[PDB]
Design a protein around this ligand. Structure first.
Ligand SMILES: *[C@H](C)[C@H]1/C(=C/C2=NC(=C\c3[nH]c(C[C@H]4NC(=O)C(C=C)=C4C)c(C)c3CCC(=O)O)/C(CCC(=O)O)=C2C)NC(=O)[C@@H]1C
Ligand SMILES: *[C@H](C)[C@H]1/C(=C/C2=NC(=C\c3[nH]c(C[C@H]4NC(=O)C(C=C)=C4C)c(C)c3CCC(=O)O)/C(CCC(=O)O)=C2C)NC(=O)[C@@H]1C
Ligand SMILES: *[C@H](C)[C@H]1/C(=C/C2=NC(=C\c3[nH]c(C[C@H]4NC(=O)C(C=C)=C4C)c(C)c3CCC(=O)O)/C(CCC(=O)O)=C2C)NC(=O)[C@@H]1C
Ligand SMILES: *[C@H](C)[C@H]1/C(=C/C2=NC(=C\c3[nH]c(C[C@H]4NC(=O)C(C=C)=C4C)c(C)c3CCC(=O)O)/C(CCC(=O)O)=C2C)NC(=O)[C@@H]1C
Ligand SMILES: C=CC1=C(C)[C@@H](Cc2[nH]c(/C=C3N=C(/C=C4\NC(=O)[C@H](C)[C@H]4CC)C(C)=C\3CCC(=O)O)c(CCC(=O)O)c2C)NC1=O
Ligand SMILES: C=CC1=C(C)[C@@H](Cc2[nH]c(/C=C3N=C(/C=C4\NC(=O)[C@H](C)[C@H]4CC)C(C)=C\3CCC(=O)O)c(CCC(=O)O)c2C)NC1=O
Ligand SMILES: C=CC1=C(C)[C@@H](Cc2[nH]c(/C=C3N=C(/C=C4\NC(=O)[C@H](C)[C@H]4CC)C(C)=C\3CCC(=O)O)c(CCC(=O)O)c2C)NC1=O
Ligand SMILES: CCC1=C(C)/C(=C/C2=NC(=C\c3[nH]c(/C=C4\NC(=O)[C@H](C)[C@H]4CC)c(C)c3CCC(=O)O)/C(CCC(=O)O)=C2C)NC1=O
Ligand SMILES: CCC1=C(C)/C(=C/C2=NC(=C\c3[nH]c(/C=C4\NC(=O)[C@H](C)[C@H]4CC)c(C)c3CCC(=O)O)/C(CCC(=O)O)=C2C)NC1=O
Ligand SMILES: CCC1=C(C)/C(=C/C2=NC(=C\c3[nH]c(/C=C4\NC(=O)[C@H](C)[C@H]4CC)c(C)c3CCC(=O)O)/C(CCC(=O)O)=C2C)NC1=O
Ligand SMILES: CCC1=C(C)/C(=C/C2=NC(=C\c3[nH]c(/C=C4\NC(=O)[C@H](C)[C@H]4CC)c(C)c3CCC(=O)O)/C(CCC(=O)O)=C2C)NC1=O
Lengths: 160, 407, 177, 161, 92, 98, 164, 206
């Protein structure tokens, strides 16, 4: 979160928190009412955000679901959508934490080692998160879509 | 003269509580007087009746279903023609006081129960009991209690108005009279059916022997051991709940005491005791480095005193004064509060806390080595190479017997 | 002992009536001035040991025969016991003013008191005066018209409670007369 | 790391008092032996390699630690010994000058016996090497100077034990 | 950033120590070990104590533990003094 | 400049961490990277690292590219940990010698 | 009567002390709860006849053996002395809802009652069946207010607890 | 000369080396949880139940735990007529399920030494998941129904081990029922006759 790494920043520097750090912990907690509303929208829209998320993913990447693709059959396609439910969950954590620190140490650190070791095309799962982003930002206003989309594209950046 | 008069002399004219009962453990807990008012509500007659049944029966279950001989002796008191002294005499003549504390009791257990029930204290010396032994055997039990409550003891310290209570009287005429007191009135839980063991010897809890401990302490001059006066104890019931830095409450006895733990603990409490005797000779003069210049920095600083508020203008600024008693000596709030923080920061007190903390850990560890032959040990320590030898062949200490067969 | 609520119940128990709305308007006025009664007992016990020394030594300068040799306040033992029974009585009025009923005063303190002072050789008519000095100080402290200490109060009326404590002090005066 | 003067100043300072007659009494005792210690440290610096060559040949040069399996077998392991014995003869020289064995446990003794047990170095043969090294050191510096230099050798042997 | 970007075999930076430490990790061990130098007899440098006990971070314990055995060291004891276990978020 | 690492002088003077730990934490400090990291290039930062955490210059060309790619991917905290965790540090300085 | 005031000036008399700040603070709670516990005092007094009728025949509904001959409730002069007895217990609850303690109950309904009902062979389980019918007839927004019902159904099962 | 001397060298030193033994940061000497108990010789059923039940992996971990391992006299004291009802069913070899929680109620996250419980009552939930109240008053500590016997045992990862006199059962733990017989209704017409018809529910029929 912004609270924990604004601390560990000033922790390492042998000092307390500046006004630049304490006027933002202050500014973040007054932002906390609006963050829970945004995460509350994505919380009980996972049925559509995931299922329509895998909608565009297969239309854009039919190789991964075609015979020979990693997510082929009734089995892998279920797990094919399971990971999108994971990453959609971590974005709800990042929105409430005000940072990608929850998304950092979960689903991002060493993610290329996992998916390379699973045979999954890491570029394909990046395409899946982008398809979820258009569904997510279509569910919110412009002021919110600059945030909810904002955490997806960070996940897109670290996932390639 | 800190205490002007004891509790055995009556309270003279000018106090509501006696002088020893003010600063003793009288005021803390429930061992107080609940003296009857003149005319009273039958609820308030039940309050003074319930304290009598607690006191003279000693937390015994009186079994309110029967109260067989009780309700004649109650109804003499509820009218008002029986005194509280005459109620507590009449309860000590009934059958339900006899079948508890006389039909199975030794004449040491009976006399030590009448001191707890009727009076407050314990029996002090040996010939104090030997009067009440010879008064029972020549006059009988009905003329024992009549000759027991009508001496000079009961009519001064309770009168004929108040119930008896445990007399935390401050001045104890042997010092063991406080020790046998707290060993008899054993805490808020234990009754005298339990303490004399009348239930466990009983045939289905009935008609058992009321045997006694502490008979060796009334014959010879021998104190009570400290575990009976600190664990199952009325001082835990009238406990001040302080922050007492040597905590007087004894720890429960540990399973698996080792001799390796004791033999370094006895060397540690000899280390602190030899270091306390060195550091206490250097106290209060040579430990104060600012003391040597107080004769001069007290006369260097007696120049240009300021009587109103305002001066020491110092070239034309304000820089005023405080002019109190404290800040004319320059002291602050951190200068009288430095006495409260004198447990960690002191040196002589630094030793005497850990002396009594580790002796109190010693006196329950050494007393837990009263269990020898089948006791399962353990090794909680890492089995290091430190080990004292078993060299106990010949005489090493040998306490001096100069009369070996002197005849 | 009774209070202001257990007086009307045992008054209603003699007629076996339920305590209904004909009697409950008099008790809901007692909890209406419940804040003023707690503000009146607090004004007396905050000034308690200085009320009695105002009164016991006020009795001496009005009748100097008590500190004459062979009197009844001549010895330090007798003067300190006279301060003792001055503040026993002022305690027992402040139980009765706190309960709003005199049935703690008349049976724990006043019962047998006149028969005690005749047996002790305590003169009765001077102890009327030491109580009657405290009656002036109890109505002064409750009305906040004490001339050298004003206590902080929310402003309003206490001529009922000043008259109520004055009815409890001449219960003490009528008992030992 | 305190010498005799540092230890005297510390104890006199730790009570906050000046250097009284007893503190200076030991300091005068140290300055009297100041001439002896330098000449003792002089010859030991000259015959450093000769003393260590004499000790190993007199104590553990021929017994089984040297033969295959024992330990000093390999040339790296043998070369570590004379490197290792050089510190004992060197740090003991420092204690002889400073007049206080604080430098030994500060820089030699701590973690030493715990280290030889890790490597499996025989503490028994080590002390006898230092004892033999103490014996030759009394040859060079004389009797009383050998008593001084010898007083820190067994300090190493005691703590290393 | 962290040591698991996607580097493995056949990648541009050389194949090296890859630790599973998060961004600015705050976990650190308390290790104990001896590490004989095995190189002083042809370098003849001064000698230093080889028995050390120190707090190494979680970010670089694996590299250090992988290296202590590189030069024949033996690890007598290690513990995780600072940090949690199974903690998803909060190691930062 | 009156700078202070009281926490590091704490954990080194007590022996809680080595000199090597105290040196590595000094390298990842912010008073360091403001001094010898921000005003320079990753090229020049690599050579200035060797003068500090190794007491010598770079030796070869491949010794550059191994340590430039590390700094290229992990920055200052990845470079100084890759020097302090090398063998060449340990052969000269292990845990006690500055 | 044991009340709030009578238990705090008895212990203060037992210590020999003036009414301190702890003694005045207990009587402040007497002012706060009297808005609730006097609302149940006038609700019970206004409807004491229908409550004692509806609880009286709930005693004989569970225990219909009492109307047998030789029993306690055999004929109509004893059942009329039964409905008086539940009326005395509902009178003491209204008496002890005004005082605020259990003073009217512990002096006039409880003390000695364990010897009387053994002597006249009265079934005490039939008393507590009639009181517990009133404890469960109580509709909490309808009969009285919510905190008046908590003050009323705390005093009835004081009477259930001391009887059985 | 002051008794509480100190550590260090150079000037301003009391003649005692740093750390009292020249070691600033001392390597520990304790073992972990389960073999500090294995050496004690009293926690034999405790270490064995941990090994069988798989809970012993949990208290292997480095998190600061406060184990309340009962001595086997406590386990031998499980032959209450009362406590044998709710605990004997775990002796069955399929009921390892409840055995892990009941053992996991004895692990407390944190290092609560007895000296840290100076007249303090603090609760906490276990690693089982339900709250337990540690109470230390008058030099006697309690953990639920523990009545701790031995004060503390220092362990590897800053963990503590207290010896308790009994076995703490979790609060909302119901004992597993004994294995029974799956019973089936013999007839079908004894059950249609057991269901009330709609015409019965309206009182149209008896
Ligand atoms: C004072 C210089 C000590 C110290 C003393 C305390 N004593 C406390 C109670 C107490 N003291 C005695 C001794 C004395 N009283 C006797 O009756 C006789 C002989 C007949 C002797 C020698 C006794 C028996 C008792 C217990 C009596 C009681 O407390 O009622 C005491 C109070 C502890 C408490 O209130 O819990 C203190 C503080 N304390 C000191 O630090 C110095 C060394
Ligand atoms: C002072 C204003 C009086 C006075 C008082 C004296 N009273 C003496 C003894 C005494 N006083 C009381 C009164 C008090 N105690 C109570 O318990 C209660 C009510 C609850 C009251 C009002 C009593 C019962 C006693 C006898 C018992 C005792 O010793 O306390 C007394 C001592 C006489 C003597 O020592 O010879 C005095 C002087 N006497 C006065 O002159 C004024 C009027
Ligand atoms: C009816 C539901 C009961 C029942 C009642 C009977 N009570 C009988 C006598 C009785 N009850 C009391 C207690 C009552 N009277 C009071 O004045 C007060 C409170 C102040 C209470 C609680 C007393 C004292 C008596 C004896 C005098 C009298 O008759 O009032 C009774 C007559 C028994 C007999 O004469 O043998 C009956 C039948 N008995 C029942 O069947 C149910 C349980
Ligand atoms: C022996 C002294 C008795 C007796 C014993 C038999 N019990 C049999 C079956 C049985 N017993 C239990 C209770 C036991 N098992 C548990 O798991 C627990 C604790 C939770 C207890 C106390 C159960 C549950 C069962 C199975 C029930 C069933 O299937 O009927 C049994 C028959 C099986 C066998 O012999 O292995 C016997 C003989 N019966 C006796 O007559 C003596 C007196
Ligand atoms: C010969 C000596 C002698 C005396 C000492 C006084 C004693 C005295 N004081 C008051 C009258 C009073 N006495 C007090 C008592 C006190 N005032 C305080 O504020 C303190 C709390 C306490 C003294 C410690 C009070 C409060 C009054 C009421 C008037 C007032 O002071 O405001 C009265 C009755 C009314 C009156 O006479 O006016 C008397 C007799 N009179 C005397 O003839
Ligand atoms: C535990 C201790 C305790 C107390 C001491 C009292 C404290 C107290 N007194 C009053 C309140 C009051 N007290 C008085 C009394 C007086 N005002 C005067 O000017 C007269 C001199 C004197 C008459 C005797 C009056 C008139 C009020 C306001 C009226 C009222 O509250 O009913 C109030 C209500 C107003 C408020 O919220 O503060 C309170 C809480 N209550 C307590 O619970
Ligand atoms: C002293 C306390 C006190 C009370 C308990 C009531 C007393 C009370 N209420 C009802 C009577 C009633 N009480 C209720 C209320 C309910 N019925 C239910 O089944 C629900 C549990 C609950 C709804 C919340 C209803 C619906 C009636 C009328 C029908 C009936 O008797 O059940 C009756 C029966 C006679 C009558 O109809 O008046 C009595 C004595 N008044 C009081 O002053
Ligand atoms: C919270 C962060 C996080 C992630 C992301 C995660 C992923 C993860 N993905 C898995 C499998 C899988 N993942 C896929 C995924 C895909 N196939 C495709 O074609 C697509 C490109 C892509 C999904 C959009 C498939 C097919 C498997 C099964 C592979 C196999 O069975 O061999 C597995 C192994 C099975 C399992 O335990 O679920 C894990 C652990 N775990 C985590 O903790
Ligand atoms: C200044 C204080 C100090 C001391 C004393 C010290 C000792 C020390 N002795 C060592 C080894 C050694 N020491 C010996 C010594 C011996 N073999 C024998 O048989 C004899 C008994 C003994 C010679 C007297 C040997 C053979 C080794 C090499 C062990 C190996 O290679 O396994 C090592 C391992 C690393 C190395 O030598 O480079 C250290 C650190 N370090 C210090 O800082
Ligand atoms: C060459 C000899 C050697 C080994 C074996 C070794 C292991 C080692 N494994 C580690 C972590 C780990 N190891 C695992 C492994 C597993 N999780 C499971 O569920 C499985 C049972 C298991 C895979 C088989 C995990 C998940 C971590 C990360 C733990 C954490 O972040 O807390 C770490 C911590 C640091 C890091 O990974 O960067 C080290 C040092 N080090 C060595 O020098
Ligand atoms: C961030 C968490 C943390 C703490 C708390 C910490 C403490 C710590 N305190 C130390 C010393 C010290 N600490 C004190 C403290 C005190 N003397 C008293 O009388 C008082 C009771 C107390 C002040 C409150 C003193 C006097 C020393 C010097 C000891 C010496 O020179 O021997 C040292 C030795 C090294 C140094 O100070 O440079 C460390 C490492 N380190 C940490 O990493």
């Amino acid at each position: 979160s912004i609270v924990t790494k604004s601390i560990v920043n000033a922790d390492a520097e042998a000092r307390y928190l500046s006004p630049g750090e304490l006027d933002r912990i202050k500014s973040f907690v007054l932002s906390g009412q609006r963050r829970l509303r945004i995460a509350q929208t994505l919380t009980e829209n996972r049925e559509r955000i995931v299922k329509q998320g895998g909608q565009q993913l297969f239309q854009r990447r039919p190789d991964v679901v075609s015979p020979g693709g990693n997510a082929y059959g009734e089995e892998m396609t279920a797990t094919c959508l399971r990971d999108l439910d994971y990453y959609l969950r971590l974005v709800t954590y990042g929105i409430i934490a005000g940072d990608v620190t929850p998304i950092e140490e979960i689903g991002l650190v060493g993610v290329k080692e996992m998916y390379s070791a699973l045979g999954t095309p890491i570029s394909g799962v990046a395409e899946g998160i982008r398809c979820m982003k258009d569904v997510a930002c279509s569910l919110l206003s412009g002021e919110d879509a600059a945030e909810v989309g904002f955490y997806f594209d960070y996940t897109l950046a670290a996932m390639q | 003269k800190v205490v002007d008069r004891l509790d055995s002399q009556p309270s003279a004219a000018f106090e509501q509580t006696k002088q020893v009962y003010t600063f003793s453990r009288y005021i803390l807990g429930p061992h107080r007087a609940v003296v009857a008012p003149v005319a009273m509500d039958p609820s308030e007659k039940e309050v003074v009746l319930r304290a009598v049944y607690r006191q003279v029966f000693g937390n015994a279950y009186i079994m309110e279903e029967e109260r067989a001989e009780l309700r004649v002796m109650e109804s003499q008191f509820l009218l008002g023609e029986l005194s509280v002294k005459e109620l507590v005499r009449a309860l000590a003549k009934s059958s339900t006081y006899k079948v508890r504390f006389f039909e199975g009791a030794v004449q040491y257990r009976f006399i030590e129960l009448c001191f707890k029930h009727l009076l407050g204290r314990a029996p002090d010396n040996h010939e104090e009991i030997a009067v009440h032994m010879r008064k029972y055997q020549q006059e009988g039990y009905d003329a024992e209690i009549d000759s027991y409550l009508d001496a000079g003891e009961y009519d001064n310290v309770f009168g004929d108005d108040t119930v008896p209570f445990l007399r935390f009287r401050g001045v104890y005429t042997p010092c063991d009279s406080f020790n046998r007191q707290c060993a008899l009135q054993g805490g808020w839980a234990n009754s005298d059916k339990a303490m004399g063991g009348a239930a466990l010897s009983g045939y289905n809890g009935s008609d058992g022997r009321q045997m006694s401990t502490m008979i060796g302490n009334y014959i010879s001059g021998k104190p009570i051991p400290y575990e009976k006066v600190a664990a199952d104890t009325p001082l835990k019931s009238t406990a001040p709940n302080w922050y007492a830095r040597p905590n007087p409450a004894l720890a429960p006895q540990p399973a698996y005491v080792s001799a390796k733990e004791i033999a370094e603990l006895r060397s540690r409490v000899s280390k602190l005791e030899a270091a306390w005797s060195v550091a206490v000779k250097q106290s209060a003069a040579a430990k104060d480095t600012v003391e040597t210049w107080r004769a001069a920095a007290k006369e260097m600083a007696a120049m240009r005193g300021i009587s109103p508020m305002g001066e020491a203008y110092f070239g034309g600024i304000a820089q005023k004064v405080d002019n109190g008693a404290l800040a004319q000596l320059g002291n602050k709030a951190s200068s009288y509060k430095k006495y409260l923080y004198a447990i960690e920061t002191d040196e002589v007190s630094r030793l005497e806390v850990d002396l009594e903390e580790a002796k109190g850990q010693l006196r329950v560890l050494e007393a837990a080595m009263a269990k020898s032959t089948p006791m399962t040990r353990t090794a909680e320590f890492k089995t290091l190479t430190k080990n004292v030898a078993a060299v106990t062949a010949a005489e090493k200490a040998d306490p001096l017997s100069k009369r070996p067969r002197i005849s | 002992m009774l209070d202001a609520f257990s007086r009307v119940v045992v008054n209603s128990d003699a007629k076996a009536a339920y305590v209904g709305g004909s009697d409950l308007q008099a008790l809901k006025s007692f909890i209406a001035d419940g804040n003023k009664r707690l503000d009146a007992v607090n004004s007396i016990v905050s000034n308690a040991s200085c009320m009695v020394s105002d009164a016991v030594s006020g009795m001496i300068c009005e009748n100097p025969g008590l500190i004459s040799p062979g009197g009844n306040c001549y010895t330090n033992r007798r003067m300190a016991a006279c301060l003792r029974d001055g503040e026993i009585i002022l305690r027992y009025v402040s139980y009765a003013l706190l309960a709003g009923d005199a049935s703690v005063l008349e049976d724990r303190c006043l019962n047998g008191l006149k028969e005690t002072y005749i047996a002790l050789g305590v003169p009765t008519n001077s102890s009327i005066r030491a109580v009657s000095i405290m009656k002036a100080q109890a109505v002064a402290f409750i009305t906040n018209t004490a001339t050298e200490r004003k206590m902080s109060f929310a402003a309003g009326d206490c001529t009922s409670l000043a008259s109520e404590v004055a009815s409890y002090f001449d219960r003490v005066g009528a008992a030992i007369s | 790391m305190q010498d005799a003067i540092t230890s005297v100043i510390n104890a006199a300072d730790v009570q906050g008092k000046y250097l009284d007659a007893n503190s200076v009494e030991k300091l005068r005792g140290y300055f009297q032996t100041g001439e002896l210690r330098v000449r003792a440290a002089a010859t030991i610096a000259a015959n450093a390699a000769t003393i260590i060559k004499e000790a190993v040949a007199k104590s553990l040069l021929y017994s089984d630690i040297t033969r295959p399996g024992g330990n000093m077998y390999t040339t790296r392991r043998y070369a570590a010994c004379i490197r290792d014995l050089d510190y004992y003869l060197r740090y003991a020289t420092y204690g002889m000058l400073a007049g206080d064995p604080s430098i030994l446990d500060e820089r030699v003794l701590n973690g030493l016996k715990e280290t030889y047990n890790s490597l499996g170095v025989p503490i028994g043969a080590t002390i006898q090497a230092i004892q033999a090294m103490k014996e030759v050191t009394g040859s060079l510096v004389g009797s009383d100077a050998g008593k001084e230099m010898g007083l820190y050798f067994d300090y190493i042997c005691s703590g290393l034990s | 950033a962290y040591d698991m970007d996607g580097t493995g075999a056949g990648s541009l930076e050389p194949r090296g120590i890859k630790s599973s430490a998060v961004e600015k990790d705050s976990r650190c061990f308390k290790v104990t070990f001896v590490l004989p130098s095995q190189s002083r007899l042809y370098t003849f440098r001064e000698l230093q104590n080889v028995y050390t006990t120190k707090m190494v971070p979680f970010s670089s314990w694996y590299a250090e533990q992988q290296r202590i055995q590189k030069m024949g060291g033996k690890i007598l004891k290690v513990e995780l003094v600072a940090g949690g276990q199974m903690r998803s978020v909060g190691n930062q | 400049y009156g700078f202070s690492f009281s926490v590091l002088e704490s954990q080194v003077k007590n022996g809680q961490i080595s000199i090597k730990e105290f040196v590595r934490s000094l390298g990842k400090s912010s008073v360091y990277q403001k001094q010898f990291y921000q005003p320079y290039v990753n090229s020049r930062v690599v050579e200035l690292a060797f003068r500090h955490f190794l007491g010598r210059n770079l030796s070869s060309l491949a010794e550059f590219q191994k340590f430039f790619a590390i700094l290229s991917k992990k920055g200052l905290t990845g470079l100084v940990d890759s020097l302090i965790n090398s063998r060449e540090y340990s052969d000269y300085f292990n845990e006690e010698t500055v | 009567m044991k009340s709030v005031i009578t238990t705090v000036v008895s212990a203060a008399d037992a210590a020999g002390r003036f009414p301190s700040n702890s003694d005045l603070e207990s009587i402040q709670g007497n002012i706060q709860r009297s808005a609730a516990r006097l609302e149940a005092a006038e609700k019970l007094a206004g409807n004491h006849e229908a409550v004692v009728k509806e609880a009286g025949d709930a005693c004989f509904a569970k225990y219909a053996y009492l109307k047998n001959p030789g029993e306690a409730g055999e004929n109509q002069e004893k059942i009329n002395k039964c409905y008086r007895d539940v009326d005395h217990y509902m009178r003491l609850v209204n008496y002890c809802l005004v005082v605020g303690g259990t003073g009217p109950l512990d002096e006039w309904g409880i003390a000695g009652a364990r010897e009387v009902y053994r002597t006249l062979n009265l079934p005490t389980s039939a008393y507590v069946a009639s009181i517990a019918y009133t404890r469960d007839r109580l509709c909490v927004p309808r009969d009285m207010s919510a905190q008046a019902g908590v003050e009323f159904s705390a005093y009835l099962d004081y009477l259930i607890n001391a009887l059985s | 000369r002051t008794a509480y001397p100190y550590t260090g060298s150079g000037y301003g030193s009391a003649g005692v080396p740093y750390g009292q033994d020249t070691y600033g940061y001392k390597a520990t000497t304790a073992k972990s949880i389960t073999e500090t108990a294995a050496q004690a010789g009293v926690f034999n059923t405790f270490v064995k139940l941990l090994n069988e039940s798989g809970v012993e992996k949990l208290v292997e971990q480095a998190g600061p735990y406060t184990v309340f391992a009962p001595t086997d006299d406590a386990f031998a004291a499980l032959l209450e007529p009362h406590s044998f009802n709710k605990l004997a069913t775990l002796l069955r070899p399929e009921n390892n399920d409840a055995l892990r929680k009941v053992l996991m109620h004895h692990v407390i996250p944190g290092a609560f030494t007895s000296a840290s419980l100076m007249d303090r009552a603090v609760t906490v939930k276990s690693l089982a998941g339900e709250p337990i109240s540690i109470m230390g008053l008058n030099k006697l500590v309690t953990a639920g129904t523990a009545k701790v016997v031995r004060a503390d045992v220092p362990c590897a990862n800053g963990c503590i081990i207290h010896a308790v006199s009994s076995v703490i059962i979790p609060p909302n733990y119901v004992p597993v029922p004994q294995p029974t017989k799956p019973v089936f209704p013999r007839s079908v017409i004894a059950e249609i006759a057991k269901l009330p018809t709609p015409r019965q529910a309206l009182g149209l029929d008896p």
